[PDB]
Design an enzyme around this catalytic site. Sequence first.
Site, short mmCIF file in Angstrom:
data_model
loop_
_atom_site.label_atom_id
_atom_site.label_comp_id
_atom_site.label_asym_id
_atom_site.label_seq_id
_atom_site.Cartn_x
_atom_site.Cartn_y
_atom_site.Cartn_z
N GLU A 29 -4.65 54.97 43.22
CA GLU A 29 -4.54 53.81 42.34
C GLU A 29 -4.08 54.16 40.93
O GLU A 29 -4.90 54.36 40.03
CB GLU A 29 -5.87 53.05 42.30
CG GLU A 29 -5.79 51.75 41.51
CD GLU A 29 -7.01 50.85 41.66
OE1 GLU A 29 -8.13 51.38 41.86
OE2 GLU A 29 -6.85 49.62 41.57
N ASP A 85 -13.16 50.67 46.47
CA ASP A 85 -13.42 51.76 45.54
C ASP A 85 -14.73 52.53 45.72
O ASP A 85 -15.27 53.07 44.76
CB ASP A 85 -13.34 51.25 44.09
CG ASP A 85 -11.92 51.23 43.55
OD1 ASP A 85 -11.24 52.28 43.64
OD2 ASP A 85 -11.49 50.19 43.02
N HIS A 93 -1.95 45.51 40.08
CA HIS A 93 -2.09 46.06 38.72
C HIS A 93 -0.83 46.14 37.86
O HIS A 93 -0.93 46.20 36.64
CB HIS A 93 -2.72 47.46 38.76
CG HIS A 93 -4.20 47.45 38.97
ND1 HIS A 93 -5.10 47.14 37.97
CD2 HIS A 93 -4.95 47.72 40.07
CE1 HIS A 93 -6.33 47.21 38.44
NE2 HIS A 93 -6.27 47.56 39.71
N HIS A 148 -2.49 51.51 36.87
CA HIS A 148 -3.81 50.91 36.96
C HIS A 148 -3.76 49.92 35.79
O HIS A 148 -2.76 49.22 35.63
CB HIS A 148 -4.95 51.92 36.80
CG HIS A 148 -6.30 51.31 36.96
ND1 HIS A 148 -7.23 51.27 35.94
CD2 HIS A 148 -6.87 50.65 38.00
CE1 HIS A 148 -8.30 50.61 36.34
NE2 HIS A 148 -8.11 50.22 37.59
N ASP A 170 -11.46 44.75 46.95
CA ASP A 170 -11.75 45.48 45.72
C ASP A 170 -13.26 45.73 45.62
O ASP A 170 -13.81 45.86 44.52
CB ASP A 170 -11.25 44.72 44.48
CG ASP A 170 -11.29 45.56 43.22
OD1 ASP A 170 -10.90 46.75 43.28
OD2 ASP A 170 -11.71 45.04 42.17
N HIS A 199 -4.47 44.60 46.42
CA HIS A 199 -5.51 43.69 45.97
C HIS A 199 -5.07 42.83 44.79
O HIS A 199 -5.36 43.12 43.63
CB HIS A 199 -6.83 44.45 45.66
CG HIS A 199 -6.73 45.51 44.61
ND1 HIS A 199 -5.89 46.60 44.72
CD2 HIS A 199 -7.42 45.69 43.46
CE1 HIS A 199 -6.07 47.41 43.69
NE2 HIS A 199 -7.00 46.88 42.91
N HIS A 243 -8.13 47.66 49.78
CA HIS A 243 -8.61 48.41 48.63
C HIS A 243 -10.12 48.36 48.42
O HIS A 243 -10.66 47.31 48.05
CB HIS A 243 -7.92 47.88 47.37
CG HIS A 243 -8.09 48.75 46.16
ND1 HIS A 243 -7.28 49.84 45.91
CD2 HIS A 243 -8.98 48.70 45.14
CE1 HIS A 243 -7.67 50.42 44.78
NE2 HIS A 243 -8.69 49.74 44.30
CL CL Z 1 -8.71 45.69 40.24
ZN ZN Z 2 -9.58 50.09 42.45
ZN ZN Z 3 -7.73 47.72 41.14
#
Ligand code: CL
Ligand code: ZN
Ligand code: ZN
Length: 391
Positions: free
Chosen positions: A123, A22, A191, A150, A320, A212, A20
């Site tokens: 996500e 972002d 999450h 999330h 992450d 993650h 993961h």
């Molecule tokens: Cl996170």
């Molecule tokens: Zn993320």
């Molecule tokens: Zn996340």
Amino acid sequence: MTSLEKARELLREFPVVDGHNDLPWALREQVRYDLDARDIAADQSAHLHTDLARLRSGGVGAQYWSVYVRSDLPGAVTATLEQIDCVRRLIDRHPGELRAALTAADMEAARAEGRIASLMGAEGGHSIDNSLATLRALYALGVRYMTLTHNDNNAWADSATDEPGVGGLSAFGREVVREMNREGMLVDLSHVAATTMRDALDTSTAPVIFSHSSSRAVCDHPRNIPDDVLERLSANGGMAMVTFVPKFVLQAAVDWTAEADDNMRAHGFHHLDSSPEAMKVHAAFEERVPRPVATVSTVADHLDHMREVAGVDHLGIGGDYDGTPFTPDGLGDVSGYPNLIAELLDRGWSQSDLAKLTWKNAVRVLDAAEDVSRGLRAARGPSNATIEQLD
Ligand SMILES: [Cl-]
Ligand SMILES: [Zn+2]
Ligand SMILES: [Zn+2]
């Protein structure tokens, strides 16, 4: 040679499949996708955790690029398509370093070519707008996993960082898992609430992942995985990809953040308030109480326990990066993975243990999703059920 030198050698043979990152969201927020302003073919250390040179230095051989979008804003589907477009543009702009990957075979092909396999993971279930056909569209566009929630609950699944809602997965939530299984999309339980984790494990006929998340036994925080859930991974065949977020992995950081949040509320502010007035209050707190700093050792502590409970065949790594502003010392950006591998070597992890952690487990799990999908696609047609019908 040193453990760090050995780590680099091991990563050259079996690189990291990170669960993961972002970067897309960071590009959306920082420059609204003006890629030339954050060209990853150049040094972006001043703005991002990620760029091509650092991914190479870090030994990353495959990356699940997150196509996360906010769940508290309308138009999540449109935003998700823009995130997917961003990933596609990055791949097209850097063909010498990146290669699109939709299958486990594609991942191995990328490794053989020396290119970073680029996959996508949505996500949050809000990305499908309670529509199974939309879930199928995301898969058609290349999404290979979807985190069920999330930070907030959605209509059919409960988040770990929200109050109890439907009690885990609702009937429609189970239908979503069934459809993900048929499509070959990995169910991601990062999450989500522990209740949701258990409901997903009961329902899924394919290995699931935690793109993650770390260990709750090692550090008590809802974003981490309970031992009872980790124990079910062997039977399920899935894997937990340890994350580096300080406020999740370091006990002192969890406590500090809780006290910081309490201080915010003490001043009449929601702990998430970002107004200049709220920031002043938080700044004052950090002034009298310095922010604790995590280290590579912190993350290794989680992996040691996760290996003991879940088994070495059910572990991965999900940093992450570019999804969190703070990082552990030694893991400041995507170039830090070798430091973690070196620490594990010092702790006695074997070369084969590490090859599983970095590369083999992830490839096995995606292949498994494909295998389960082949069976389900031949057994029945897609679902046309609605949330109203089931919930
Ligand atoms: Cl996170
Ligand atoms: Zn993320
Ligand atoms: Zn996340």
